[PDB]
Every structure is written in C-alpha cells, then in structure tokens.
Write a protein that binds this ligand. Structure first.
Ligand SMILES: [Cl-]
Ligand SMILES: [Cl-]
Ligand SMILES: [Cl-]
Ligand code: NA
Length: 129
C-alpha cells in the first residue's frame, strides 16, 4: 500500500508514535517519506547481505527474520515479511523498540540526513489529526 501523507500521519498517531521518546509526529512522517516513499512494500538490499523492509526500512541484521541473513538477530520477534503489510502495526511496534535502543532516530540514515534539524512540522501541516 502507498499511503498518503496525512493518512500515514493519522495512522501513526493512532498507534502512539506522536511524541514517542520525544519525537514529534512530523519526524516519523519525514522518515517514512525518505526511507520508503510511503510504500509499505519497499525492500532494499544492503552490501552486507541484510535487507531493509517496509515503510520504515527496518533491517534484517538485527530486527526481523528473513531466513537469509546469517548470524543476524530477530529482536522484534517477527518475520520480515510482516513489515510489508498494509497494516502498519508490526512496523510501528518494532520501530518503538529501535528508537528506545540508545541512538534514537539516528538509527534511520534518511532521518539523520534529511529530517533532523529541519522544520518537520511541515510534514503534518493541513492534516486533520
Ligand atoms: Cl511534528
Ligand atoms: Cl537469517
Ligand atoms: Cl533521543
Ligand atoms: Na535477522
């Protein structure tokens, strides 16, 4: 599923991401825009053989099991395919574990390079939330 900007904002708010660990909702929408272009089915292979999955591009080296990343962890206790669903619940719940891990949203390279320090509130402007 390809979400609209305000549709995704509303779904993320319903799942408790607004101000989660101090990150306002616009940070999460901005991260999703640049990680996946709002597409739940996005996948991308990394040089180390791991793969990133879903709207927040969660990586199989640590967070989910895809059966083809030897020596990796599955800290969210989910198959990586669950992160591609049109229902964002699994992605949100796993993202909450990632952002609590110590480095905050710096875990998402696109957030660090394209959202951090910008006017992230623009990503939720005009939305009925
Ligand atoms: Cl915001
Ligand atoms: Cl594996
Ligand atoms: Cl933080
Ligand atoms: Na894994």
């Amino acid at each position: 599923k390809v979400f609209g900007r305000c549709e995704l904002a509303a779904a993320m708010k319903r799942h408790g991401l607004d101000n989660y660990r101090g990150y306002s909702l616009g940070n999460w929408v901005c991260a999703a825009k640049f990680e996946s272009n709002f597409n739940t089915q996005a996948t991308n292979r990394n040089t180390d053989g791991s793969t990133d999955y879903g709207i927040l591009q969660i990586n199989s080296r640590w967070w989910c099991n895809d059966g083809r990343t030897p020596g990796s962890r599955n800290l969210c206790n989910i198959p990586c395919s669950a992160l591609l669903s049109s229902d964002i619940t699994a992605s949100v719940n796993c993202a909450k574990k990632i952002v609590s891990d110590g480095n905050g949203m710096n875990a998402w390279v696109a957030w660090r390079n394209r959202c951090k320090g910008t006017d992230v509130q623009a990503w939720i402007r005009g939305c009925r939330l």
